[PDB]
Structure 1
Amino acid sequence: DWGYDDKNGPEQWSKLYPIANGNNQSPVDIKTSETKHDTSLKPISVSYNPATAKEIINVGHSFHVNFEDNDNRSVLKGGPFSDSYRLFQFHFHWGSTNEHGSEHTVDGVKYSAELHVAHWNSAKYSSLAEAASKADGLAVIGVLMKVGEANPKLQKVLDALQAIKTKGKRAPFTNFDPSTLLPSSLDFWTYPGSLTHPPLYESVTWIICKESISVSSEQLAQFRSLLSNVEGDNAVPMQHNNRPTQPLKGRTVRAS
């Protein structure tokens, strides 16, 4: 029902999802002069099992890669967390132009796209569906993607998109460790926030990497060539899916 278009996009979401105007909404601009270093943060540790890669799915507004989440084979730990979070998905956001496709910004600087690697709290909760609405339920690593050289690490993913061109299509996507997509250093910022699209629950601990990764102009074009319509209907490109930044409302962004 909601989308990213003028009629149903971010500026309209608060009508059906009032929490859009809440105190812990994402994404945010990270003003580096205002970050606070927390001596209790530990380094991030990611430990993903490539055999957990399962399927790629076109969901109309975006696409994602899911990973088997029945057990703790693939986990994020460290950082601000006291226990491990289980990997379940990764996806991207992009924009209509290379100039602004990221959701998070840094000192007002907009990147071309953004990678999200999503996990849920399997220490405290027993399912993604339980964890999704809890303040401590989800942990998402964000990586800002700077347009420039083509990124070869994206290749398996981009090559798969031909199999999921229209809304609802899905295909097997196996033997893939998405830590291969992360930057070499996992220095990061963390703040309490939300899902960036409806239902916008304030359930996400964000881990935003200090270091960016690359993406080419033509790789971004491949994202925008996915279609938001169902097969047989007239082709409608998925041109953009990034939410604008939202007020900090007194939250602190912590620096590792």
Structure 2
Amino acid sequence: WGYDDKNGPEQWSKLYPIANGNNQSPVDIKTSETKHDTSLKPISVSYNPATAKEIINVGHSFHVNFEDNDNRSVLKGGPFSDSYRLFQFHFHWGSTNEHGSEHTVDGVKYSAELHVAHWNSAKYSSLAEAASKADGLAVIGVLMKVGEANPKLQKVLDALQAIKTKGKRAPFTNFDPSTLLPSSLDFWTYPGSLTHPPLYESVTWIICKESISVSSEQLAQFRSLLSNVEGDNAVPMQHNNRPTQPLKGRTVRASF
């Protein structure tokens, strides 16, 4: 699977029927229709830089994995009663600065989007087990607006030269991804899914209202990553964001 014309988002329903489900992500957040929930507690993240493990080129994107054998790096608060264990973060981008984010706010598309994923370690004992549970995954989404260079992305960006082609991987250690989050953690939350196959509707989304910046050149670096295996003709990763999906009755709650 990928985002090309033949194997993109529009063709995912073929092997994954859940793609047309009632809890799919991403979605367009309409602020006039969100419901402020007074019960929503503040988002609390506490990550240990030592849990950073490695970075991998998966063909359609790349992601940074974290050791998730214990609760050294966790997420709490918000709409959760359980503690969620950090295990990965990655980005989504588009072919041009005009688009790239997965979620949209009042129809506005941003240039990219950061996803920090965690799994429910209070109820399950592994990502594999939690991945398909309705309450198994928690993912923070941060909209990235094209503008000033984001120094926080530096380490991530510098590591890409070692995993240029599909399947390459390299250690990525000593990094706390909470340093990538916006100053304010006011958020929107709704029940959704993974935005890439298998598309399980096991994700409780936490979308930050505040965006973070990224320069046009930094985005270029993402797009310069290759989706081909070493040796083949270079084929740049131009985009990997899935179109917004129907809310189908779901209510998007706001912590503010």
RMSD across aligned C-alpha pairs, in angstroms?
Answer: 0.4
Q: What is residue 148 of structure 2 aligned with on the other side?
A: 149
The CA distance in 2 between the partners of 1:15 and 1:202, in whole Å, is: 17
The CA distance in 1 between the partners of 2:131 and 2:98, in whole Å, is: 32
Q: Which runs of 5+ in 2 are unaligned?
A: none
Residue 226 of structure 1 pairs with residue 225 of structure 2 = yes
The CA distance in 2 between the partners of 1:131 and 1:168, in whole Å, is: 25
The CA distance in 2 between the partners of 1:148 and 1:40, in whole Å, is: 35
| Per-residue deviation, residues 16-59 of structure 1 (Å, max 9, x unmatched) | 10000000000000000000011111000000000000100000
The CA distance in 2 between the partners of 1:51 and 1:96, in whole Å, is: 34
| Per-residue deviation, residues 100-142 of structure 1 (Å, max 9, x unmatched) | 0000000000000000000000000000000000000000000
Q: Structure 1 residue 83: deviation in Å? A: 1.2
The CA distance in 2 between the partners of 1:75 and 1:154, in whole Å, is: 21
Q: Structure 1 residue 168: deviation in Å? A: 0.6
The CA distance in 2 between the partners of 1:28 and 1:197, in whole Å, is: 14
The CA distance in 2 between the partners of 1:180 and 1:138, in whole Å, is: 21
Residue 9 of structure 2 aligns to a residue whose secondary structure is coil
Residue 185 of structure 1 aligns to a residue whose secondary structure is coil
Q: What is residue 207 of structure 2 aligned with on the other side?
A: 208
The CA distance in 2 between the partners of 1:156 and 1:181, in whole Å, is: 11
The CA distance in 2 between the partners of 1:155 and 1:91, in whole Å, is: 14
Residue 11 of structure 1 aligns to a residue whose secondary structure is helix
Residue 56 of structure 1 aligns to a residue whose secondary structure is strand
Q: What is residue 88 of structure 2 aligned with on the other side?
A: 89
| Per-residue deviation, residues 86-106 of structure 1 (Å, max 9, x unmatched) | 000000000011000000000
The CA distance in 2 between the partners of 1:215 and 1:203, in whole Å, is: 29
The CA distance in 2 between the partners of 1:51 and 1:62, in whole Å, is: 24
Normalization by structure 2: what TM-score?
Answer: 0.99
Residue 12 of structure 1 pairs with residue 5 of structure 2 = no
The CA distance in 2 between the partners of 1:247 and 1:91, in whole Å, is: 24
Q: Which runs of 5+ in 1 are unaligned?
A: none
Q: Structure 1 residue 4: deviation in Å? A: 0.2
The CA distance in 2 between the partners of 1:216 and 1:18, in whole Å, is: 37
4+ runs deviating over 3 angstroms: none
| Per-residue deviation, residues 185-207 of structure 1 (Å, max 9, x unmatched) | 10000000000011000000000
The CA distance in 2 between the partners of 1:173 and 1:66, in whole Å, is: 8
Q: Structure 1 residue 151: deviation in Å? A: 0.3
The CA distance in 1 between the partners of 2:194 and 2:79, in whole Å, is: 18
The CA distance in 1 between the partners of 2:167 and 2:13, in whole Å, is: 26
Normalization by structure 1: what TM-score?
Answer: 0.99
Residue 156 of structure 1 aligns to a residue whose secondary structure is helix
Q: Structure 1 residue 3: deviation in Å? A: 1.0
| Per-residue deviation, residues 140-176 of structure 1 (Å, max 9, x unmatched) | 0000000000000000000000000001100010100
The CA distance in 1 between the partners of 2:82 and 2:213, in whole Å, is: 31
Q: What is residue 24 of structure 1 aligned with on the other side?
A: 23
